[PDB]
């Protein structure tokens, strides 16, 4: 590799997740075939974003305003807060067409191992948002990390007068028990819902 500009692009691109050396090069030689209007629009989009994009002060969902669109929106159920690990989960639980409440983003998951505690995550700004006649849905992951963060959150929010809930551990949609993990099945079972009471 010689032209430093190409060596420079491969590097920066390869610094991105899900894109190795071989794929970065594959990518640099595609950018070469493109017309300058796009490269600029890609660059600008990146920058516009890096500048315009900031974390919401209330919940910490990503936006470019004073409050996130969720916080602003008045038709949104102002009584339920869905705590989540990452802003991407907000989209996931949003494009899920079954939740119109408020969200809250701990920008990560707890992990005692790496001294990462409820001070490296936006857990503080959540407390004041929680009151009575409200529900706090805990939608953190299901790794020992998500499981741990949630139980920590449960403990913390307890003293405030809200209903705390955790999303359902269970078999995913479109699967058969045979290929479902053991611990999942045991949870899908113990957490079984009654569809009819005699």
């Amino acid at each position: 590799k010689y032209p430093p500009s190409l060596v420079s692009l491969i590097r920066e691109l390869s610094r991105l997740p899900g894109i190795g050396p071989k794929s970065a090069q594959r990518l640099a030689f595609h950018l070469f075939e493109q017309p300058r209007e796009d490269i600029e629009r890609l660059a600008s989009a990146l920058l516009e974003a890096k500048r315009d994009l900031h974390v919401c002060p209330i919940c910490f969902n990503i936006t470019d305003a004073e409050k996130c669109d969720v916080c602003a929106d008045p038709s949104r159920d102002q009584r339920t807060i869905c705590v989540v690990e990452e802003p991407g989960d907000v989209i996931a639980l949003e494009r899920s067409g079954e939740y119109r409440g408020l969200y809250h983003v701990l920008h990560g998951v707890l992990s005692p191992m790496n001294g990462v505690g409820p001070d490296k995550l936006h857990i503080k700004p959540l407390l004041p948002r929680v009151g009575q006649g409200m529900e706090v849905i805990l939608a953190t992951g299901t790794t020992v990390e998500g499981d741990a963060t949630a139980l920590y959150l449960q403990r913390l929010l307890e003293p405030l007068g809200a209903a705390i809930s955790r999303i359902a551990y269970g078999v995913p949609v479109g699967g058969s028990l045979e290929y479902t993990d053991e611990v999942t099945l045991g949870r899908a079972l113990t957490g079984r819902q009654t569809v009819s009471k005699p």
């Binding site: 995913p172 949609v173 479109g174 699967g175 058969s176 290929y179």
Partner: protein
């Protein structure tokens, strides 16, 4: 390039002995068989899905490298409604011989699935969409002239060819006017227009039977979607 991004609807799924997932997709550019070795089990029937496929050295079967869930219909989990996409999916797959197949056929197929998902009368949707699909396949029943002698405006069933016979060539009584009217104009006029003019459930079996006879006489195959009727 030579991986490609494709979007479409899951019309069939296999879970093999090995534990793979082979799926047939109907797509705008449609006709796609692919396999996802082994997470990506949102590749269930009737899910609209985006996939990254790598074909490779002429392997007869492309392979999945990422699948999205672009749009589902949970309503389709219901029994009566569900009984109108299988026939829809199995019908479409049989009807189109594999070269065939734009984007028009795909939009109509997707429409038929929203139809059977949200609409009070899934059977009527399935009937209308099936005959409508006959147009986009270029297999249109001749309805203007008796199938045997050529006489204009035949009213009678055609047991041998699924079309219509005149009173001289027919051995069976004439179809009821609601059935004739549908047979004559359904392929040509709007899907909206036909939903607005249902046919009594009593007269529908005659409509299904004509479709079966027509399609088995005109298109090759072991039309297994009739288990669908």
């Amino acid at each position: 390039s030579r991986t490609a991004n494709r979007s479409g609807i899951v019309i069939r799924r296999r879970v093999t002995p090995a534990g793979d997932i082979i799926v047939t997709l109907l797509t705008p550019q449609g006709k796609l068989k692919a396999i996802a070795r082994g997470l990506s089990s949102s590749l269930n029937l009737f899910h609209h899905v985006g996939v990254q496929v790598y074909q490779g050295p002429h392997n007869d079967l492309a392979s999945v490298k990422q699948a999205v869930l672009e749009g589902a219909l949970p309503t389709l989990a219901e029994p009566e409604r569900y009984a109108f996409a299988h026939l829809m999916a199995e019908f479409a797959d049989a009807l189109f011989q594999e070269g065939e197949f734009s984007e028009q056929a795909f939009d109509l197929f997707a429409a038929s699935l929203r139809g059977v998902a949200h609409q009070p009368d899934p059977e009527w949707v399935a009937l209308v969409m099936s005959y409508k699909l006959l147009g986009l396949a270029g297999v249109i029943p001749q309805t203007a002239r008796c199938a045997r002698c050529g006489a204009p405006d035949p009213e009678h069933p055609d047991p041998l060819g699924g079309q219509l016979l005149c009173s001289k060539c027919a051995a069976l009584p004439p179809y009821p006017p609601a059935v004739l009217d549908f047979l004559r104009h359904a392929v040509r006029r709007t899907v909206r227009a036909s939903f607005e003019q249902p046919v009594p459930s009593a007269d529908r079996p005659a409509l299904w039977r004509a479709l079966e006879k027509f399609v088995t006489v005109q298109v090759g195959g072991v039309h297994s979607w009739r288990q669908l009727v």
